[PDB]
């Protein structure tokens, strides 16, 4: 064949730290379907947002948003343990069906995204060259996000511990911990990985008695 009907750009969803995770690659022939399992970003997360994206960039913010829906009712669990099955199906009419299903709760939500959605032909060529020009920056972004997500997890866990600790934790331990949480949050907004890891460190150093209490 000299002609093939294809989805012209990658389709996928936003995942923790502003990353696009691809479910269908660019140039895949239609009809097609694919599924992948995802989980929650934080302990006890009760809902997830499925932000559907078209584009070749690893930064979610630089891809074309197609729609979004939430899936609620995820039962309490440590982060990474729920199994949220995401399915993208493009039918022969170019209609995109996306669903998410929580295997423990049985709950499911879905959206339909019509065939004319997303980028037009001019924008598709633009998107491809932009991802090529930004290949190496996007590889560094993905590294930055791995570290930001670790930092985000520590911030969350430590804060839950502060709460649960109540008065068992001495007041000057709490003062130092709050300062170190703020400094870690500030660092998370930068693009320097070492800077983030250094604040995680400064936090852990003021956290030993709290680690003892929690334990």
């Amino acid at each position: 064949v000299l002609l093939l009907d294809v989805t012209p750009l990658s389709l996928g969803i936003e995942t923790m730290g502003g990353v696009m995770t691809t479910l269908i690659a660019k140039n895949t022939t239609i009809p097609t379907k694919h599924s992948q399992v995802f989980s929650t970003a934080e302990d006890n997360q009760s809902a997830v947002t499925i932000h559907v994206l078209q584009g070749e960039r690893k930064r979610a913010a630089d891809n074309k948003s197609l729609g979004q829906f939430n899936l609620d009712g995820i039962n309490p669990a440590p982060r990474g343990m729920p199994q949220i099955e995401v399915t993208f199906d493009i039918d022969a009419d170019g209609i995109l069906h996306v669903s998410a299903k929580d295997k423990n709760s049985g709950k499911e939500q879905k959206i339909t995204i019509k065939a004319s959605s997303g980028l037009n032909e001019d924008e598709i060529q633009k998107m491809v060259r932009d991802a090529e020009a930004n290949a190496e920056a996007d590889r560094k972004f993905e590294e930055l996000v791995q570290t930001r997500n670790q930092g985000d997890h520590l911030l969350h866990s430590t804060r839950k511990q502060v709460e649960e600790a109540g008065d068992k934790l001495p007041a000057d331990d709490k003062t130092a911990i709050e300062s170190a949480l703020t400094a870690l949050e500030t660092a998370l907004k930068g693009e320097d990985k070492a800077a983030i890891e250094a604040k995680m460190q400064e936090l852990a150093q003021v956290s030993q008695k709290l680690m003892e209490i929690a334990q």
């Binding site: 995942t15 990353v19 995770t21 929650t40 934080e42 809902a47 997830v48």
Partner: peptide, 8 residues
């Protein structure tokens, strides 16, 4: 598995 954000 990659992780998903909660609703804002």
């Amino acid at each position: 598995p990659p992780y998903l954000p909660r609703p804002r």
